């Protein structure tokens, strides 16, 4: 019962879900070969990892799980590494030719020669779960199969599976660590078509991840392996709640009905504390004070947009380690008397908290520090609405002169499919606008 | 895999193909006899972009040599790594196009075609996953500017959704005064603009410069010429050769560097360019802008930059590379349009190029590429003008209306750079 | 009440059913016009490919009567 499916669409998708799916091992005892020995159900069971994770008669604890990209190097190096045995050969699907950073190539003409067979492999997960609850999406907004592949995916997974839950992780581009020049016009596309088939979706902004390497961890020139540690830290913290129980642990859906006051106002900002070196942390414990003050520091949000300048539609607070609710309560007090936090006149100024119990883990060889308590504030800002207006504003420079429009339209794609997409993000952006203003 | 198949066509196609084989060989440490003896995995990671593999552990060029006439690939033959192309891959013919684009395209060039094309399908047949193709060839001889264009046109109708590339070496009066060689470089452009995906504009004019200017080499010779061009085309391929994520294959090449269609012109360039006897990232990434350091005889400074890829290669500081890369555009930032953002993509590759403990490679879709293809109209204009030597052409069967088509299309293409040079955000 | 609580679940019913059913059409319907567009295009590639061979014959022909002079 419970399960929730997992899909990595892409390099960056997959790259992740490398990421995440060796952090729960590590934290729910997994070995790299699957076997689990604290768990005494063999080949079954209804724990709380069991969301995430099937089991075999022999064993094995087997990710609930499908990596798919349009090209086969990079699953490759999960089919030939460390973790896999992990993985049944079927949930890893690859094509032969990528989607060259194009959208039309990942949507269309690649991505339809491939959809039919993640449906199916998708569907053999589907059929192991007594009480599926719905699926959670990684890809990036930029790449041609994260942006083109994703949205085609979500499209025919509303088909089939109706309005079962899909929650996204969508990595959004920083200049950083870029490799396309038509990576907005990606993310725009991607963003209009995925709209109406997403419940809930978690943006990463990769230069807020890049920044909080650079300062926080002291890393010259941060590698996607450090922005992805950290990234997975955050997922899990989202996810714990799902793969543990717990008194006081709050399961994601109850945060989600305070997140989403309107459909398309389904995504909500990110805030991750302690992120910390192990040389920094060696001899300081972070108090509960302390970790929860940093999650109104916008250094420390996971997409760059000041909260400061918005309004407040939801603040949720997920505690994990070692956390009881009289710290968070004088720490949440302190933080009211002392904040920029503005909420709409029609929503209710409650800090939402929840706190599971299992203290936070690291990989070995990683940047963070291992820490007795980690916190991610889960916020519904107007301030998020920052991150489409730059993103919507390079689309609109290039666009004015139909810059490397050719490379889409001979994939098939007309030019009405780019105003369309536009005309949505300018209703979006205009949606979290009326959002904010007070009621009459 | 995704397999890239080359072609050189007429002397110099076939010239600095050979150059650029025995630079890559090396590179890969793939030796003479096809055999591998190199020390590091990075080599032969995606050494099937390149090379097939065939028994005895050897690699084999994915390469085919083309010319009208025996001589050139009798040499090629007799190069360095001679024997490790494949025997069935030289087709040659007899005649010889004697300078002239017509007999190239039109009448021997169409005679010996459909030959290379069975070499051309034979290569694509067993290829995992076809990328394209890459072509090297001179546009002011007869093979490589006339057939050359011809085989584009030909292999672009049986393989129309993979990516055509080119290395086309621009003719010069300071190297060549063969008088016709302005009519067959207009007339290969007005082919290039319509059938290639991407082309790297080498220019013999820039080549001279540089070795007469820069180095003090008061008479360059075509191996002096060629050392620039082959430094060139091992860099502007070792994204396509080596690991790495940015312009990994053709495709995403083309689509970072090309935002119209017919605007695929790009201007290469390469440091170090120093005398004999006369090195740091702020000191290669300055000299990889300058005018002196283009393979191409353009002034970015007389226009704008459309995109730029940029690949620094050898052991250096990552973080040195992006703040002086930032640093480079923030002090030019009138060179580069405002309506296309963050166009200019920069890769670091661990492996430097032969000798060098660091390098920098080059590639810019500029406006200022319109200077290269004046010249070449100033010269064609003069002689067309005249009508000089057109008997040479239309007794092939040509007629006066093809070259005035030809000549319009490269004025098309020079308006239509000076449009987006002129082009504002506002 | 009973009549009502009925027809509550029954629009629920129907309005995920039309939910699916306008998202089945709307593929079918994009995947069509892409299809047919990009079809089109090469079809316009290899129509002036198919000109350039015509082209190419027009000439070794008007050399052929030149030589019969
Ligand atoms: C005439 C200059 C010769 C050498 C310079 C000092 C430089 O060498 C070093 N180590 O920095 C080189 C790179 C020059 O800047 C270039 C102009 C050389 C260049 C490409 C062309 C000249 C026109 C040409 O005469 C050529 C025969 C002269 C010297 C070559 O042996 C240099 C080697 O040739 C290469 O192509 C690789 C890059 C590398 O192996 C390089 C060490
Ligand atoms: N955080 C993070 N971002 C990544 C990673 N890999 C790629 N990206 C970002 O993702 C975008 C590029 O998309 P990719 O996922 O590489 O592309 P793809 O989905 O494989 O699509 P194609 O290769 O075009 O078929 C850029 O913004 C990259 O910076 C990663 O491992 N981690
Ligand atoms: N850079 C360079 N240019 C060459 C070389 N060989 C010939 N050229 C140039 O190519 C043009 C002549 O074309 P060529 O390839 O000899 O004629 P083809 O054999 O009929 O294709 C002239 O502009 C020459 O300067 C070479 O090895 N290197
Ligand atoms: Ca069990
Ligand atoms: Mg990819
Ligand atoms: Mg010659």
């Known amino acids: 019962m419970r399960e929730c499916i997992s899909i990595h669409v892409g390099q960056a998708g997959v790259q992740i879900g490398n990421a995440c799916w060796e952090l729960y091992c590590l934290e729910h005892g997994i070995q790299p070969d699957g076997q689990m020995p604290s768990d005494k159900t063999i080949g079954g069971g209804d724990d709380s990892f069991n969301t995430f994770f099937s089991e075999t008669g022999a064993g094995k604890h087997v990710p609930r799980a499908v990596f798919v990209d349009l090209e086969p190097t990079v699953i490759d190096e999960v089919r030939t590494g460390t973790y896999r045995q992990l993985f049944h050969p079927e949930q890893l699907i690859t094509g032969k030719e990528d989607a060259a950073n194009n959208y039309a190539r990942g949507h269309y003409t690649i991505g339809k020669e491939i959809i039919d067979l993640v449906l199916d492999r998708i569907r053999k997960l589907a059929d192991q779960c007594t009480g599926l609850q719905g699926f959670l999406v990684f890809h990036s907004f930029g790449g041609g199969t994260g942006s083109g592949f994703t949205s085609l995916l979500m499209e025919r997974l509303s088909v089939d599976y109706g309005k079962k839950s899909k929650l996204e992780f969508s990595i959004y581009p920083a200049p950083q660590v870029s490799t396309a020049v038509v990576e907005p016009y990606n993310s725009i596309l991607t963003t209009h078509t995925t709209l109406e088939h997403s419940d809930c979706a978690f943006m990463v902004d990769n230069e807020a991840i890049y920044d909080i390497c650079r300062r926080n961890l002291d890393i010259e020139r941060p590698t996607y392996t450090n922005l992805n540690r950290l990234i997975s830290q955050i997922v899990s913290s989202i996810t714990a709640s799902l793969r543990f129980d717990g008194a006081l642990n709050v399961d994601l859906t109850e945060f989600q009905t305070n997140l989403v006051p309107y459909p398309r106002i389904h995504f909500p900002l990110a805030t991750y504390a302690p992120v910390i070196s192990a040389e920094k942390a060696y001899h300081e414990q972070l108090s509960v004070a302390e970790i929860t003050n940093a999650c109104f520091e916008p250094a420390n949000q996971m997409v760059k947009c000041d909260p400061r300048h918005g309004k407040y539609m939801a603040c949720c607070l997920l505690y994990r380690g070692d956390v009881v609710p009289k710290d968070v309560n004088a720490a949440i007090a302190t933080i009211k008397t002392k904040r920029s936090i503005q909420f709409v006149d029609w929503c209710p100024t409650g800090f939402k908290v929840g706190i599971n119990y299992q203290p936070p883990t690291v990989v070995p060889g990683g940047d963070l520090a291992k820490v007795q308590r980690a916190v991610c504030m889960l916020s519904n800002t107007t301030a998020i609405a920052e991150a489409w207006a730059r993103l919507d504003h390079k689309f609109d420079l290039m666009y004015a002169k139909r810059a490397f429009v050719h490379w889409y339209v001979g994939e098939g794609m007309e030019e009405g499919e780019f105003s369309e997409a536009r005309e949505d993000m300018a209703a979006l952006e205009k949606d979290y606008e009326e959002v904010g203003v007070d009621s009459v | 895999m995704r397999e890239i198949v080359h072609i050189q066509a007429g002397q110099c196609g076939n010239q600095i193909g050979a150059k650029f084989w025995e630079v890559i060989s090396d590179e890969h440490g793939i030796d003479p006899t096809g055999s591998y003896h190199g020390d590091s995995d990075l080599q032969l990671e995606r050494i099937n972009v390149y090379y097939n593999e065939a028994t005895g552990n050897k690699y084999v060029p994915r390469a085919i040599l083309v010319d009208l006439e025996p001589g050139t690939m009798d040499s090629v033959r007799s190069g360095p790594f001679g024997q490790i192309f494949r025997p069935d891959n030289f087709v040659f013919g007899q005649s010889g196009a004697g300078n002239n684009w017509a007999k190239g395209h039109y009448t021997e060039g169409a005679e010996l075609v459909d030959s290379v094309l069975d070499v051309v399908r034979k290569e694509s047949e067993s290829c995992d996953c076809l990328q394209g193709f890459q072509l090297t060839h001179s546009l002011g001889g007869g093979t490589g500017s006339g057939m050359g264009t011809l085989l584009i046109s030909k292999i672009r109708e049986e393989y129309p959704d993979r990516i055509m590339n080119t290395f086309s070496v621009m003719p010069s009066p300071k190297v060549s005064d063969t008088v016709v060689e302005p009519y067959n470089a207009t007339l290969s452009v007005h082919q290039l603009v319509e059938n290639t995906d991407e082309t790297y504009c080498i220019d013999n004019e820039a080549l001279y410069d540089i070795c007469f200017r820069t180095l003090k080499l008061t008479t360059p010779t075509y191996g002096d010429l060629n050392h620039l061009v082959s430094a060139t085309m091992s860099g502007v391929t070792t994204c396509l050769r080596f690991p790495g994520q940015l312009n990994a294959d053709l495709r995403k090449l083309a689509v970072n560097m090309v935002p119209f269609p017919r605007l695929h012109f790009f201007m290469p360039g390469f440091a170090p360019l120093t005398s004999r006897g006369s090195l740091t990232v702020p000191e290669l990434t300055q000299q990889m802008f300058d005018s002196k350091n283009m393979m191409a005889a353009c002034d970015p400074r007389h226009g704008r930059y459309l995109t730029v890829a940029a690949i620094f290669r050898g052991r250096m500081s990552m973080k040195e590379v992006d703040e002086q890369m930032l640093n480079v555009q923030n002090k030019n930032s009138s060179y580069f349009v405002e309506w296309i953002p963050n166009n200019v993509k920069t890769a670091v590759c661990d492996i430097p190029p032969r000798g060098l403990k660091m390098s920098a490679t080059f590639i810019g879709n500029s406006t200022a590429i319109q200077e290269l293809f004046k010249r070449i109209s100033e010269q064609f204009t003069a002689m067309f003008r005249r009508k000089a030597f057109l008997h040479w052409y239309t007794g092939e069967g040509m007629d006066e209306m093809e070259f005035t088509e030809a000549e319009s299309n490269m004025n098309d293409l020079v308006s239509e750079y000076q449009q987006y040079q002129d082009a504002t955000a506002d | ?69």
């Open chain 3, 1 to 69: 009440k009973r009549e009502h609580e009925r027809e509550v679940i029954q629009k629920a019913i129907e309005e995920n059913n039309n939910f699916i059913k306008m998202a089945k059409e709307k593929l079918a319907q994009k995947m069509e016009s892409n299809k047919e567009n990009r079809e089109a295009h090469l079809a316009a590639m290899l129509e002036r490919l198919q000109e350039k061979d015509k082209h190419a014959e027009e000439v070794r022909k008007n050399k052929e009567l030149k030589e019969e002079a």
